Structure 1
Amino acid sequence: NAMNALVATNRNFQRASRILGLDSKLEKSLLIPYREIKVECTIPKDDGSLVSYVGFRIQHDNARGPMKGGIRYHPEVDPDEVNALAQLMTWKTAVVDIPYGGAKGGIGCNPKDLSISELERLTRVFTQKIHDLIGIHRDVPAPDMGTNSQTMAWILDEYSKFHGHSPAVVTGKPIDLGGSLGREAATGLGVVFATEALFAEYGKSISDMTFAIQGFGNVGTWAAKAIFERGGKVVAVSDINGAISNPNGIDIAALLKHKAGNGSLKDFSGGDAMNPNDLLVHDCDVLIPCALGGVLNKENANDVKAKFIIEAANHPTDPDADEILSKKGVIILPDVYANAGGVTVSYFEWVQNIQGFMWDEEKVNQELKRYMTKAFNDIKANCKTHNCDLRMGAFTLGLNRVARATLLRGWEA
């Protein structure tokens, strides 16, 4: 089904390089990651027996600043996937013009199969094995699929044994350990700010549309909530265990309460249970993938009903699907812009930490809006001077900014 994640991302990178006319030698430098790290992570389970994993940290580019990107605990984590995600962070940070490069990490494990004490030990061992490589001004992790603010607390705590109290070494922290107000909701809310900027160009409002949402974690819950509050009609939601639909709109606040009491989507009373395999091809105006990458591919792209796709997940649409969907008249707001709210507020968390003084939530949200608005305006102008679609307008915008910084730094030893 899914195209190789790194093959897909490199095809977009090649398409973007051609638009900019990049010299092949500069292009090759920008493609190769700065550093790839794979480390053994062996822990005792709660009964004392050993389990061994491999942890990864791919540091793709640091021309524009310390590297930035989250840590995924998921059974399909592998070098290709982490490499593709890391490269995308390099472009995304540059799209929103925050002073970071790109990185990504992960462990190939299933968190549902580990106890909370095992997850803590695994997280601390991973931190021990990379403590030299990450750092406030080197590489700053954060959550991603299968990790959360408690995971980041353990990274902070273990890292600080080696280098002293270092709040800014990781973002997505709990509020009570130096996290930023607004960070938990930031990706989902930024999706909404990105969607509003796009709909403004077409003269539409969120309240005009129906929505289908794949995935219901940190990104999908906050995105659905924010859409729901602004009058959007959310007609289907899936997660790994099932899905729920309602053509008149799901009461998202009620669905989230039901979820917080350990209810499953399929059992929610204000909707009809559905097969999650039918989510991406469900009738809707706007489709928002909020789970795995590569899920829109040559096999299902012709059956997409949506007129808009908002890429909240990282690389949910492969290049085969891009072209099919373009010919169906579908507009795709690309991941490196639409889901950048998270890393943007991560930047603000990091700033607050190094300034030793936290901001109020209204300032975090004012700055998020300003960053997301400016990035969209830059993409629009870039699509014009280069006469390209939104994915390429954002991709070339970030790639060109990375090239500039790379060229200023130079190459002598």
Structure 2
Amino acid sequence: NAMNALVATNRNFQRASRILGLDSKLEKSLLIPYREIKVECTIPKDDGSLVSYVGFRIQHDNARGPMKGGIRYHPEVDPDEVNALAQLMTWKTAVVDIPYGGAKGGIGCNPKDLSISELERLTRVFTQKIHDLIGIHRDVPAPDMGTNSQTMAWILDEYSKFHGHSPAVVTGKPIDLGGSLGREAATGLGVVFATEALFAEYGKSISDMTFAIQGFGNVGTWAAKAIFERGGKVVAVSDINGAISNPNGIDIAALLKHKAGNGSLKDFSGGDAMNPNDLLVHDCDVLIPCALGGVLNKENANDVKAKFIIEAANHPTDPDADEILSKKGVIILPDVYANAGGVTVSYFEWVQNIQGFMWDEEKVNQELKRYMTKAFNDIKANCKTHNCDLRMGAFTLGLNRVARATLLRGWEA
């Protein structure tokens, strides 16, 4: 069903470039990634047998600063997916106006099939194969799907053997190893800040709406929690194993405790088991994909019931679906704004580390709000000047900023 992820993202890039009127020589330069790296990651399993993976780091653009983006452990990781995500990082960092470029990495593995000692070895080997290509002022990784703060701990620890203690080389670290308060919740919280800014334009509140949510990991859990706390009615949640629904609202706080006690969604007592394939076409006001990309496509977009889609996941909606949904009257808050809370707080974590001195947690949340509000106000204005939809409003905002810094740096050797 999914359209190729890089095809889809390049169509969006082209659409934004045509709005800005970029010439084709500058456009070509901004499309092509600065550097693509593929490296062998081979480790012994716990029984001593060998397994070989290919690890990727795509460094898409560094005109606005060191490159930034997470590392994904997932069986569908491939060069196309990583190139698409790295490119999106470049635009997203420029949308929230933090001094980073864009990058992304990953390994095509299934963490569920690997022991924790095997994941550690795989993470350290991957770090050994890319340490020369990343760095505090060069490219700063972070967690994405299938990774978490413990993953980043291992990267920090292995990288520091080659370059000395380097807290700022990775973000999403545990608090005890230099992480920032607020970073774990930042993406889902940022999704809610972005949603609140949007709904304010319609005079609506989150407490007026019903929500369906696909995915229930780092982004989905914190997003659902924050919506729930503000009085939103979360009527359906899915993950890779099952789904749960309740037209009166799921008690998300109880769903999260159930999950932490290792329960499956479909066994939750406060809801009805649901086929997860029904999630995206479920009746709701607001749909929030928090899992894979490309899941809203030509084949299901006409059966979406929501009036709003908040892109918490990266590129959940492909260009075919964009157009179908636009004709249905659906408003889509794009990934390159809505899920930017995470990289924004990663920036604060990095600042705190290089300043050698941590901020109070209230400053982290004060600034997150300030950055997400400023960026929504920039997107609004850009939509007005370019008479475009929210996706292109944000995409052209970031692309234009990246073009401006690239031209400023020049091209002579």
**Cα distance, 1:253 vs structure 2:** 0.1
Task: Give the distance between the partners of 2:38 and 2:48, measured in 1 at CA.
Answer: 25
Could you say what secondary structure the match of 1:352 adopts?
A: helix
Offset from partner CA, 1:20-53 (integer Å, 9 cap, x none): 0000000000000000000000000000000000
Task: Give the distance between the partners of 1:310 and 1:360, measured in 2 at CA.
Answer: 30
Match of 1:371 in 2: 371
Task: Give the distance between the partners of 1:184 and 1:360, measured in 2 at CA.
Answer: 15
Task: Give the distance between the partners of 2:75 and 2:212, measured in 1 at CA.
Answer: 25
Match of 1:62 in 2: 62
**Cα distance, 1:148 vs structure 2:** 0.2
Could you say what secondary structure the match of 2:243 adopts?
A: strand
Could you say what secondary structure the match of 2:211 adopts?
A: strand
Offset from partner CA, 1:364-402 (integer Å, 9 cap, x none): 000000000000000000000000000000000000000
Could you say what secondary structure the match of 1:131 adopts?
A: helix
**Cα distance, 1:352 vs structure 2:** 0.1
Offset from partner CA, 1:51-101 (integer Å, 9 cap, x none): 000000000000000000000000000000000000000000000000000
Match of 2:144 in 1: 144
Task: Give the distance between the partners of 1:345 and 1:384, measured in 2 at CA.
Answer: 28
Q: Give the count of matched residue pairs.
A: 413
Task: Give the distance between the partners of 2:146 and 2:271, measured in 1 at CA.
Answer: 27
Task: Give the distance between the partners of 1:276 and 1:134, measured in 2 at CA.
Answer: 38
Task: Give the distance between the partners of 2:386 and 2:249, measured in 1 at CA.
Answer: 39
Task: Give the distance between the partners of 2:217 and 2:353, measured in 1 at CA.
Answer: 26
Task: Give the distance between the partners of 1:134 and 1:351, measured in 2 at CA.
Answer: 17
Could you say what secondary structure the match of 2:60 adopts?
A: strand
Task: Give the distance between the partners of 1:148 and 1:184, measured in 2 at CA.
Answer: 9
Task: Give the distance between the partners of 2:12 and 2:42, measured in 1 at CA.
Answer: 36
RMSD, aligned CA: 0.2
Task: Give the distance between the partners of 1:189 and 1:398, measured in 2 at CA.
Answer: 22
Length-normalised TM-score, structure 1 = 1.00
Task: Give the distance between the partners of 1:380 and 1:281, measured in 2 at CA.
Answer: 28
**Cα distance, 1:233 vs structure 2:** 0.1
Could you say what secondary structure the match of 1:394 adopts?
A: helix
Could you say what secondary structure the match of 2:132 adopts?
A: coil
Could you say what secondary structure the match of 1:25 adopts?
A: helix
Task: Give the distance between the partners of 2:164 and 2:237, measured in 1 at CA.
Answer: 43
Offset from partner CA, 1:125-147 (integer Å, 9 cap, x none): 00000000000000000000000
Offset from partner CA, 1:227-249 (integer Å, 9 cap, x none): 00000000000000000000000
Match of 1:170 in 2: 170
Q: Which blocks of at least 5 consecutive residues in structure 2 are unaligned?
A: none
Offset from partner CA, 1:163-211 (integer Å, 9 cap, x none): 0000000000000000000000000000000000000000000000000
**Cα distance, 1:159 vs structure 2:** 0.0
Length-normalised TM-score, structure 2 = 1.00
Task: Give the distance between the partners of 2:273 and 2:64, measured in 1 at CA.
Answer: 47
Task: Give the distance between the partners of 1:360 and 1:77, measured in 2 at CA.
Answer: 37
**Cα distance, 1:121 vs structure 2:** 0.2
Task: Give the distance between the partners of 2:162 and 2:316, measured in 1 at CA.
Answer: 37
**Cα distance, 1:298 vs structure 2:** 0.2
Could you say what secondary structure the match of 1:283 adopts?
A: coil
Task: Give the distance between the partners of 1:105 and 1:376, measured in 2 at CA.
Answer: 28
